[PDB]
From TrEMBL, chain A:
One of its GO terms (molecular function) is structural constituent of ribosome. It is found in: Cytoplasm; Nucleus. Keywords: Cytoplasm, Nucleus, Ribonucleoprotein, Ribosomal protein, RNA-binding, rRNA-binding. Residues 1-44 form the Large ribosomal subunit protein uL5 N-terminal domain. Belongs to the universal ribosomal protein uL5 family. SUPFAM superfamilies: RL5-like. It comes from the Eukaryota. It comes from Plasmodium falciparum (isolate 3D7). GO terms for cellular component: cytosolic large ribosomal subunit; nucleus. This is 60S ribosomal protein L11a, putative. Residues 45-120 form the Large ribosomal subunit protein uL5 C-terminal domain. One of its GO terms (biological process) is translation.
Automatic annotation (TrEMBL), chain B:
GO terms for molecular function: structural constituent of ribosome. It comes from Plasmodium falciparum (isolate 3D7). Belongs to the eukaryotic ribosomal protein eL21 family. It comes from the Eukaryota. One of its GO terms (cellular component) is cytosolic large ribosomal subunit. InterPro entries: Ribosomal_eL21, Ribosomal_eL21_CS, Ribosomal_eL21_sf, Translation_prot_SH3-like_sf. Pfam families: Ribosomal_L21e. One of its GO terms (biological process) is translation. The keyword Ribosomal protein applies. Keywords: Ribonucleoprotein, Ribosomal protein. Gene3D superfamilies: 6.10.250.3260, Ribosomal protein L21 (2.30.30.70). The keyword Ribonucleoprotein applies. This is 60S ribosomal protein L21.
UniProtKB/TrEMBL annotation, chain C:
One of its GO terms (molecular function) is structural constituent of ribosome. One of its GO terms (cellular component) is cytosolic large ribosomal subunit. PANTHER family: 60S RIBOSOMAL PROTEIN L10. InterPro entries: Ribosomal_uL16 (IPR047873), Ribosomal_uL16_CS_euk_arc (IPR018255), Ribosomal_uL16_dom (IPR016180), Ribosomal_uL16_euk_arch (IPR001197), Ribosomal_uL16_sf (IPR036920). This is 60S ribosomal protein L10, putative. Keywords: Metal-binding, Ribonucleoprotein, Ribosomal protein. Mg(2+) binds at N13. One of its GO terms (biological process) is translation. It comes from the Eukaryota.
Automatic annotation (TrEMBL), chain D:
Keywords: Cytoplasm, Nucleus, Ribonucleoprotein, Ribosomal protein, RNA-binding. GO terms for biological process: ribosomal large subunit assembly; translation. This is 60S ribosomal protein L5, putative. Belongs to the universal ribosomal protein uL18 family. Residues 214-249 form the Large ribosomal subunit protein uL18 C-terminal eukaryotes domain. GO terms for cellular component: cytosolic large ribosomal subunit; nucleus. CDD domains: Ribosomal_L18_L5e.
Length: 124, 155, 189, 252
RNA sequence: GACUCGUUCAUACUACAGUGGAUACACCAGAUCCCAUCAGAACUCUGAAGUUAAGCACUGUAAGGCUUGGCUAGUACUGAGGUGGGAGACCGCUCGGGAACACCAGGUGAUGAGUCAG
RNA sequence: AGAACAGAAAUCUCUUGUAGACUAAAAGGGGAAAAGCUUGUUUGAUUUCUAUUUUCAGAACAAGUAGAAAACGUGAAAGCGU
RNA sequence: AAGAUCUCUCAGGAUCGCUGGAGUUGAUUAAUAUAAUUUUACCAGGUAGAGAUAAUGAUUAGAGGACAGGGCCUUGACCUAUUCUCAAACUCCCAAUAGGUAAAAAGGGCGAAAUAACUCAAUUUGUAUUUCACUCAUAUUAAAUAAAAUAACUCCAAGUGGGC
RNA sequence: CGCGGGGUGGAGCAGCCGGUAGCUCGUCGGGCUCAUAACCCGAAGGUCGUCGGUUCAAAUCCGGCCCCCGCAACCA
């Protein structure tokens, strides 16, 4: 059939909490590990993070890979060791939400859910 | 006690329900002439050019038009005298008045009637005459189908 | 002690309940309200009797408490505690104020006009006259003159006794616990 | 509390229908519409450009109380009549579409004889104003290409110059409207990988268009354009509702 | 049949379903150049390989809401009059004007201008 | 609803979200492709003048509104900025 | 007249209001101007009322559900539909009363010609103005009714500013 | 009953001038001494009257209640 299961985003995120040498080192390490330039937190910068996409995200998952209630209802998931990250899945046609000319909502019976994600996890 | 500009307008300059936010462009496009009568009726979104409390829902002649302003001569009672006061209002607050539109429609029908009456060579009376005269009248209801009523008793 | 209540026979001045503006209110005497078999359903009793306003009585918090407690004791002594429900239908909310410029807070009243039930008792058909008598005793602790009524409603629901039986017979009335829904032919099952 | 409630539904006020669709800004639109009130009987022309994912649409619209009256209209798939069969979304197509709409407008007026506009790139013509087009503004956007084409066509649309290259560069603009950048990318793509080139530009090959040919074809087309402009009912629902309620109980 | 600009601004909303894809829309493919970011996600640019799975359109639902109409109710309320009544509080009468919630029944849009394939 | 340290609160993500936030400060109005928040460019918080509106004598002062004559600032332009 | 504004002002003064005189204008053509009046059009409202199942603040009960307390069970909170009584400084809806514009001749219709340094692409493309036209009821008056000019307007001044 | 000042360790003062609460005595553990103190060394201890509010941050600033002291009641 037409339908699909696909990664949307993987996010590396570290709220270090010492706000200096370790954080600056960590963000450079995260950049070294996956090429994309980091983006950063605030203060009550305390945290470093970056988005990872497609093939590259799958590579990070693959090294990561080697509780069953880790999944969200929307089929997204993450873990740590130590160092940690989180994965969001969305199939094609998600664009309709963002698409500026005609922004709108996806059908409920077309959203990813738990079951498809769980099957994908078993698949890989 | 205090008497600032918007003094006593909490209820009056409130929005009507389901009418919140900016209103349609096509309100603004509405065409105005010098010597039109025009009502001053104010949406509360646009705050510049907002007229004083007394002029809300009032009507008067347009005497001057500007870029997005309209001058309206409005009558105000000042103690023992009514005088005409130059209220500047916005395109937002002007509503085309309707008393004139009844006169215009009345004139149009009368003009056609005048043309017909002149064509037929018979006089007519334009007058918006009395209400009260009733001709003689008939009730054809069957004599046992008429409704029989009596007073209402207590609880 | 406090002001002699005779003055508050008249209803006058704007309503003055508690507010963000006011602060510093004295508490009600009556925080007790209703008595009897509290969680009892409408199907579990059959009648209702009512003590009804007839003076334009303000009704002090203490008067409401005093009447109710007296009523309750008379009901428990006569007809037993679990064999009725005594309902305090009116709720005081209006705060008086006094001086020895604006008055300092004084006790709570309800400012009640004529034709409103103040107190009501729900019970079996056997004890409605007893309940009416308890209300008659209660009236002697209410300001001015009141009136008394016994309804042909099934009670604690707006339906007639005959209406209750008919709707119940054809299953059109379902109890949600005292409160009852009349089935209006809508929604899922 | 749960998010969705009767009070919330009752209170909620809808946004305007076209804004729901996504089409109209309103805030820009009213300024685009509204003439100075003392300057009555003159209605601001919108030069409408909307960029569809298949071809671009260029209109002359004039606002009236019962809605916009459309004076002139051009779509890229009219360019087919002028020998352009592919590249409909393109910058070059947008320029041509703009030129074509202006030419059609001028022909309608008969003003074409007075103002031909400038033949080929580096009393007064009618003034008109570019539509919102709902796009985040950029150098080299297709709305600007269409505005340039319309101006070169003949219209007096007033504009700034830094949404074209060189923030001015005429050569880069000239390359853009010719399609030279497409041609160079085709040649580069062929150099890199020929399967990848064929798989990309499938239509251009079917049409029989090489990279070289695009600029010439656009010049020929410009000259050609210049030369020649169910519902159910209540009784039925009652019967059906009764039957389905009975049936589901009888089945289960 | 399809689309663009609109208009009224819920009959147009919301919620869950079902039905539809000649042309079209869209989803979708790519990043050299213009461009844009943490990210071609968006935006920008360039494509046209696939697809109704979605968007979108249409319809359905004891839907919710909104919306008209009845009924609530000539009830509540109220202007004027009265050497009218009532201990007062208040309540009639004469001349007049006159609601709202709930409930019940219906409805769930219409439309200006232009375009493409009929 | 999920994710190392990380817990009731720390950051990050997806879903839902008519404003229940915020709008220097009072309280009340208005405000969702903003009037809120982030960012870019800036100093019109400019010079000159009316008709006026508010208070009201319909004097003053003070606060406004709608324009005009300049010079510019900003935006792709319409525009907007006293 | 005992209202008003400013006042070292509160037993006062000034200036407004109301009053008188004097004049002029209008008037004599049963009218038009005009009006503590309605009519028919046309608006503007959020006080009385009404509401808590619309928001805010309250506020009494049970019922149905998946984090906490007590000793596998129970009590709560919490979600969900209800339920009792509510507000000068709360508002879904919402009066009466009071208020404004309207009912044609120094004007209005539809036409022509003129004028601009305003106006649009565009010397009729509009705008506005002006000159010429053609013509709108009033020979009971483009809804009534009116000891409707006893109306206007100017001048000069008084008394008054503690009222009940 | 009308005005104005004040509530922080067991006790009494600092901080109380917004983020990090100090000092002494008292209390507590160890020394010294026939024995006990005095004396020496080292620690523990603040819930900032209470209910609500501002502010990035409140024990402090902002209110209302609760206590505590200071004024006040005069011409009649």
């Amino acid at each position: 059939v037409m339908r699909e299961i696909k990664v949307n985003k993987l996010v590396l995120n570290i709220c270090v909490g010492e706000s200096g040498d370790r954080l600056t080192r960590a963000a450079r390490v995260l950049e070294q590990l996956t090429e994309q330039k980091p983006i950063f937190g605030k203060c009550r910068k305390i945290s470093c993070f970056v988005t990872v996409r497609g093939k590259k995200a799958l590579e990070i998952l693959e090294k990561g890979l080697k509780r069953r209630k880790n999944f969200s209802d929307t089929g997204n998931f993450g873990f740590g060791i130590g160092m940690d990250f989180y994965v969001h899945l969305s199939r094609s046609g998600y664009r309709v939400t963002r698409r500026t000319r005609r922004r709108s909502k996806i059908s409920k019976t077309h959203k990813v859910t738990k079951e498809d994600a769980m099957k994908w996890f078993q698949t890989k | 006690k205090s008497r600032g500009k918007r003094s006593g307008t909490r209820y009056k300059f409130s929005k009507k329900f389901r009418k919140h936010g900016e209103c349609t462009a096509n309100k603004y496009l509405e065409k105005l002439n010098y010597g039109d009568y025009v009502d001053i009726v104010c949406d509360s979104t646009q705050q510049k050019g907002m007229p004083f409390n007394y002029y809300h829902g009032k009507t008067g002649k347009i005497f001057h038009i500007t870029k997005r302003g309209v001058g309206v001569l409005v009558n105000k009672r000042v103690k023992h005298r009514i005088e005409q006061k130059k209220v500047c209002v916005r395109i937002e607050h002007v509503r085309k008045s309707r008393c004139n539109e009844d006169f215009l429609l009345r004139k149009i029908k009368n003009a056609e009637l005048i043309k017909e009456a002149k064509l037929k060579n018979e006089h007519i009376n334009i007058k918006r005459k009395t209400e009260g005269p009733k001709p003689a009248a008939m009730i054809k209801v069957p004599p046992s189908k008429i409704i029989t009523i009596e007073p209402l008793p207590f609880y | 002690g406090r002001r002699p209540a005779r003055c508050y026979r008249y209803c006058k001045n704007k309503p003055y309940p508690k507010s963000r503006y006011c602060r510093g209110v004295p508490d009600p005497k009556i925080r007790i309200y209703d008595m009897g078999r509290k969680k009892a359903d409408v199907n579990e009793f059959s009648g209702v009797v009512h003590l009804v306003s007839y003076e334009y009585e303000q009704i002090s918090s203490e008067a409401l408490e005093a009447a109710r407690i007296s009523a309750n004791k008379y009901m428990i002594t006569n007809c037993g505690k679990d064999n009725f429900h005594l309902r305090v239908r009116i709720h005081p909310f209006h705060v008086l104020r006094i001086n020895k410029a604006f008055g300092k807070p004084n006790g709570v009243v309800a400012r009640v006009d004529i034709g409103q039930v103040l107190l009501s008792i729900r019970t079996k058909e056997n004890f409605v006259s007893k309940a009416c008598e308890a209300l008659r005793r209660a009236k002697y602790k209410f300001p001015g003159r009141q009136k008394v009524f016994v309804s042909n409603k099934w009670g604690f629901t707006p339906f007639s006794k005959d209406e209750y039986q008919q709707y119940k017979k054809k299953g059109r009335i379902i109890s949600d616990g005292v409160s009852c829904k009349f089935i209006r032919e809508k929604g899922p099952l | 509390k749960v998010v969705k409630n009767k009070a919330y539904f009752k209170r909620y006020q809808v946004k305007y229908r076209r804004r729901r669709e996504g089409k109209t800004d309103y805030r820009a639109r009213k300024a685009l519409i509204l003439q100075d009130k003392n300057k009555y009987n003159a209605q601001k022309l919108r030069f409408v450009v909307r960029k569809t994912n298949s071809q671009v649409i260029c209109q002359i619209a004039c606002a009236h109380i019962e809605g916009d009256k459309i004076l002139a209209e051009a779509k890229s798939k009219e360019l087919i009549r002028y020998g352009i069969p592919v590249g409909l979304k393109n910058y070059a197509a947008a320029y041509a579409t703009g030129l074509l709409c202006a030419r059609r407008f001028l022909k309608s007026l008969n003003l074409d004889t007075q103002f031909l506009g400038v033949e080929k790139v580096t009393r007064k013509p009618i003034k008109a104003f570019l539509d919102v087009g709902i796009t985040r503004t950029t150098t080299g956007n297709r709305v600007f290409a269409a505005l340039k084409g319309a101006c070169d066509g003949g219209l007096n649309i007033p504009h700034g110059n830094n949404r074209f290259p060189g923030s001015f560069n005429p050569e880069q603009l000239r390359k853009n409207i010719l399609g030279i950048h497409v041609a160079e990318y085709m040649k580069t793509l062929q150099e890199e990988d020929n399967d990848k080139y064929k798989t990309h530009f499938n239509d251009y090959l079917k049409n029989n268009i090489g990279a070289d040919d695009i600029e010439q074809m656009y010049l020929n087309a410009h000259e050609k354009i210049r030369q020649n402009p169910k519902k159910l009912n209540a009784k039925l629902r009652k019967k059906r509702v009764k039957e389905k309620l009975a049936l589901y109980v009888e089945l289960q």
